[PDB]
């Protein structure tokens, strides 16, 4: 009991089990560790980043290897619409003969792959279980590279200084140009060279790539400027993916819409997209100043941006030193951007499927959308939590203030009451009225008179759909009109492909919407606004309030301020994150429920079921949950079991973890300390067990630890039960 929390002497002197619990939960809070400097902080974060990237690459290599070894990738190539992809084999000694038989796929029990990796790897030009093995080998090599780099940059002569870590202009130039633009350029190179011929039956491997021309003219049009030659003769409308029948020779085209066979974006479209992105990012990577006297100094840009009339105070003068010296501001910005980006991925990979035959893989579509939306919610909550942490421990009012006047960030704490009050008003407005309309529909339909329902046509959103070319709402607006300047401009470039895809009932591109979509979008807006209210209130009130005008002196995470002055439960900024996690889970649940029910009705064909029953709550409860839960719960019955048996077990497991979270959330400490004391007395006063005594005094979990454990149980149960439900329902309903 003197060397586990090596980074904290205060914890290492704790005689109780709290030392072990807090040793885990404070291991990555490097700024709070004993004998801590900024240089060591940045160096340790750098090495941890290297180890993390190595972990990511090892995970991808493992996926590749297990698909290559125990999957059916090669068989799935020849029949992608009937063969179900296999993730990996199963060896579990607890299986009975029935479980072995039900999970048996080809040669061994195996799990279907819901990650969509088969379609992704097939699209980028993989046709052999030896191509996957090469990828796994290369990724393990890259992981070894990253681990070696992480070790190296902790060595004495190779540890970077604070100036290098805080060199904003150099890092931005390189990140933007090199990372984004050059990675897009290399991806365009791969796309063209390998993927484009492989979709046309020509194999371009690591042997015949220096001799197989990606285009017949071969780099002559690029240098000659005849760039149109790369767009001539695109893939026809009768092209079979992976075969030369009906193929073309173009490598960079505008076609819009989807491939007629795979129902996915054209490979030549994506290569052109990545080439354009590469050029744009390489250009944008020269903005900031470096050792060659030209570029921008972002301190000057920030300082010079003060509106002349004066409404943002003194502008952004103190923001450069604020962001540079704080790792929580940057982390919050990065997390917010990543959350928006992965929300974008979720919202675009279902409307615009980019991988061949992924549109017809309904379980993987649902799994991908749900996974990315949950990750998005997590990232957004993390961004706001780290903003609150920045307020608590990194914000300096003196830097953000010049002669009494406050800069753009410090002014957010002046009208903080206005911001919180208006967030509260919007949340109450949306909640009151969305619930009112939903309950009105509930009562009116229940009384047998559905005609008295309040159904608001989402005209604003249908207006947007018509603007992009959907001739379904009779708006004749911008691209629904053939005479508008928006249509004549692109009538020869990408409208014929785009219009043919947007005006198709079998796509998810701009799904038709009705009053149910209106109501559920308002519910989503309410969830977003309430989660934002909780997080913004916690961030702004992090440094203090009327109930605790010295909250900054207690840190980001503390249990409370006591029992007097009223009370003081959940007063810290960490508690705001803790409360907003429930609202994030609820909002993501609403979003994923809406998406999954809409797509289940679209795939099954009974879109009238959603359009009618989605306007009232009992419609949701009866036709989504109760209706589609039947295949899942019958994964094993007193008569037998199916391959969905694991999903029913995970369903029950998620319910159990959810209710254990309920334990940890409803029942607080103090009730568990006295019980533990009784147990301690019982152990101390019993023979044959007095010979064994604890080294750490058993104590109840701390208030903050109990909140974290209850939140973890709640979230894990939530995620597990919904994943089981969505996957099993899709599989058991749509064959």
């Amino acid at each position: 009991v003197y060397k586990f929390p090596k980074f904290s002497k205060a914890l290492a002197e704790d005689p109780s089990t709290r030392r072990i619990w807090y040793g885990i939960a404070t291991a990555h809070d490097f700024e709070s560790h004993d004998a801590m400097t900024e240089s060591k902080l940045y160096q340790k974060i750098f090495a941890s980043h290297f180890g993390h990237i190595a972990i990511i690459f090892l995970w991808t290599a493992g996926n590749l290897f297990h698909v290559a070894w125990q999957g059916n990738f090669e068989a799935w190539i020849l029949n992608p619409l009937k063969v179900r992809p296999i993730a990996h084999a199963i060896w579990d000694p607890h299986f009975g003969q029935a479980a072995y038989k039900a999970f048996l796929k080809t040669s061994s029990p195996a799990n279907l792959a819901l990650s969509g990796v088969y379609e992704w790897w097939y699209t980028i030009g993989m046709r052999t279980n030896n191509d996957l093995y090469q990828g796994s080998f290369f990724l393990i090599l890259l992981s070894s590279l990253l681990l070696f780099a992480g070790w190296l940059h902790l060595q004495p002569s190779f540890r970077p200084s604070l100036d290098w870590f805080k060199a904003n202009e150099y890092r931005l130039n390189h990140h933007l140009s090199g990372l984004f633009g050059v990675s897009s350029l290399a991806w365009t190179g791969h796309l063209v060279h390998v993927a484009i011929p492989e979709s046309r039956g020509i194999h371009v491997g690591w042997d015949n790539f220096l001799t197989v021309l990606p285009h017949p003219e071969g780099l002559t049009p690029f240098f000659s400027g005849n760039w149109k030659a790369y767009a001539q003769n695109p893939d026809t409308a009768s092209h079979i993916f992976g075969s030369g029948e009906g193929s073309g020779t173009a490598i960079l085209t505008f076609l819009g819409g989807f491939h007629p066979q795979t129902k996915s974006l054209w490979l030549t479209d994506m290569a052109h997209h990545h080439l354009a992105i590469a050029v744009l990012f390489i250009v944008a990577g020269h903005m900031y100043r470096t050792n060659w006297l030209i570029g921008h100094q972002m301190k000057l840009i920030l300082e010079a941006h003060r509106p002349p009339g004066g409404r943002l105070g003194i502008g952004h003068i103190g923001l450069y030193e604020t962001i540079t010296n704080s790792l929580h501001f940057q982390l919050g910005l990065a997390l917010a951007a990543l959350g928006v980006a992965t929300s974008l991925t979720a919202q675009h990979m279902y409307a615009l499927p980019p991988y061949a035959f992924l549109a017809s893989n309904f379980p993987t579509q649902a799994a991908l959308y749900t996974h990315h939306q949950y990750i998005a919610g997590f990232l957004m909550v993390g961004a706001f939590a780290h903003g609150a942490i920045f307020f608590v421990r990194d914000y300096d009012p003196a830097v953000n203030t010049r002669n009494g006047e406050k800069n753009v960030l410090a002014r957010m704490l002046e009208h903080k009451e206005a911001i919180i009050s208006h967030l509260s008003w919007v949340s109450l407005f949306l909640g009151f009225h969305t619930l009112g309309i939903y309950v009105h529909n509930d009562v009116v339909v229940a009384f047998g008179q559905p005609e008295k329902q309040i159904l608001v046509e989402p005209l604003f959103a249908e207006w947007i759909q018509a603007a992009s070319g959907k001739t379904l709402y009779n708006f004749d607006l911008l691209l629904a009109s053939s005479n508008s300047p928006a249509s004549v401009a692109s009538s020869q470039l990408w409208l014929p492909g785009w219009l043919s895809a947007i005006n198709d009932g079998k796509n998810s591109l701009f799904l038709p919407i009705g009053p149910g979509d209106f109501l559920v979008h308002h519910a989503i807006a309410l969830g977003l606004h309430t989660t934002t209210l909780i997080l913004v209130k916690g961030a702004l009130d992090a440094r203090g309030s009327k109930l605790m005008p010295d909250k900054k002196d207690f840190g980001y995470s503390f249990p409370c301020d006591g029992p007097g002055r009223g009370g003081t439960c959940d007063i810290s900024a960490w508690d705001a994150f803790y409360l907003a996690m429930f609202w994030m889970l609820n909002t993501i649940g609403w979003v994923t429920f809406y998406w999954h029910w809409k797509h289940l009705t679209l795939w099954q064909g009974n879109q009238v079921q959603f359009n009618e029953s989605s306007n009232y709550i009992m419609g949701w409860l009866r036709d989504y949950l109760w209706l589609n839960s039947s295949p899942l719960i019958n994964g094993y019955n007193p008569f037998g079991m199916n391959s969905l048996s694991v999903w029913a077990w995970m369903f029950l497991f998620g319910h159990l973890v959810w209710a254990t979270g309920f334990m940890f959330l409803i029942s607080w400490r103090g009730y568990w300390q006295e019980l533990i004391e009784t147990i301690v007395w019982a152990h101390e006063r019993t023979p044959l067990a007095n010979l064994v005594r604890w080294k750490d005094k058993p104590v109840a979990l701390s208030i903050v630890q109990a909140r974290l454990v209850g939140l973890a149980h709640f979230t894990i149960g939530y995620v597990l039960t919904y994943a089981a439900f969505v996957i099993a329902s899709t599989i058991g309903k749509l064959g």
Binding site: F65, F137, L154
Partner: peptide, 30 residues
């Protein structure tokens, strides 16, 4: 179907990546 040699050398290379991982783990200190 991959051969025994392919899986074996991948396992051996994985071992090398493991020794590199503990070296990074031990260098990040106890």
């Amino acid at each position: 179907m991959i051969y025994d040699s392919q899986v074996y050398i991948a396992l051996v290379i994985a071992v090398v990546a493991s020794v590199l991982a503990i070296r990074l783990g031990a260098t990040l200190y106890n």
